[PDB]
Structures are given as structure tokens and as C-alpha cells.
Write a protein that binds this ligand. Structure first.
Ligand SMILES: [Zn+2]
Ligand SMILES: [Zn+2]
Lengths: 114, 48
């Protein structure tokens, strides 16, 4: 799924096929380096892209004075009353008006969607 | 000609009193606006 880099010239490793043993190999074409491919998968395509936004959500967003905050929904980790909420804030997010909450109070940074 | 010269008798105008409704009507309009705001808030929360 990801991209692996060479350790000699630090170029990109492309998938190669080991004919003699029948195992997936990652061979850089800048040099002769070849390495064993652990994941055995090359490419993954989520065209419907059911991606989670909280992995793209940063904790310092809770410091924004322009964002609304409610004490209704508390933090799961630290149980703090006040939490800032906002929508997807992302394009190509299909049709989603759901709420992504970020817990306030310093060093918590917890986030959750409901 | 004849209608303008008759309006010379009756007269026509527009004024502040022509642009205000009864206090009951104002209360009804405010109640309708409040109900609309409550309904749209409920819709926003339901979509949330
Ligand atoms: Zn290389
Ligand atoms: Zn918290």
C-alpha cells in the first residue's frame, strides 16, 4: 500500500517478481538492491474512500476561538465537560454533516465522532 | 383626466401607518419566526 525507499541510493523500490523462488521482491532500478516484501500487497484503492477524519484531525484545533464548543458531550478519556465540535471541514467527503468533537483542556487532545 | 380630477377630491398617499400591522399581528409574526427557527434548529441537529 505504501512506498518503500532504497537504503543505498535512497530511491523508490518497485515491485519485482522472483522467478526462481516465486516470492514478491522490491527491486530498486537505480541500483541492484532487492529486498523482501513483507506485506505481499502493492496497491489498495478505496474509491468510495471510507476514510476516518479523526486520523487527519489535529489536537490544536481545540485552541481555535472561532469554533463552537458545548459542555453536553464529555471526553471519553479525561471526562472534561467542554469540547469543541466541527463538521468534516474536508472536500470530497461524500455527503457528511456529522460532528467531529475535540476535547478541550491542555494535553488531552482526545477526539471522537458521534 | 376625469379620474385624476376626482382624486383631486379623494386624495391618495402612503405613510408610516400604512406600513405597520396590529400588535396581535406582530406577536403572531414573531411566534411564526420563532417556530421556524426552532424547526430549522431541529433539522440541523437531526442532520448532525
Ligand atoms: Zn537503489
Ligand atoms: Zn479529555
Amino acid at each position: 500500500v505504501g512506498i518503500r525507499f532504497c537504503q543505498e541510493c535512497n530511491n523508490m523500490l518497485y515491485p519485482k517478481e522472483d522467478k526462481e523462488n516465486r516470492i514478491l521482491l522490491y527491486a530498486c532500478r537505480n541500483c541492484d538492491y532487492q529486498q523482501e516484501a513483507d506485506n505481499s500487497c502493492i496497491y489498495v484503492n478505496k474509491i468510495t474512500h471510507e476514510v476516518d477524519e479523526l486520523t487527519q484531525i489535529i489536537a490544536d484545533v481545540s485552541q481555535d476561538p472561532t469554533l463552537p464548543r458545548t459542555e453536553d458531550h464529555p471526553c471519553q478519556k479525561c471526562g472534561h465537560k467542554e469540547a469543541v465540535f466541527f463538521q468534516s471541514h474536508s472536500a470530497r467527503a461524500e455527503d457528511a454533516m456529522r460532528l467531529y468533537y475535540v476535547c478541550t483542556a491542555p494535553h488531552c487532545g482526545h477526539r471522537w465522532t458521534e | 383626466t376625469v379620474i385624476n380630477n376626482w382624486l383631486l377630491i379623494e386624495g391618495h398617499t402612503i405613510g408610516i401607518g400604512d406600513s405597520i400591522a396590529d400588535s396581535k399581528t406582530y406577536q403572531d409574526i414573531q411566534n411564526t419566526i420563532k417556530k421556524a427557527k426552532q424547526d430549522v434548529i431541529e433539522v440541523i441537529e437531526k442532520a448532525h
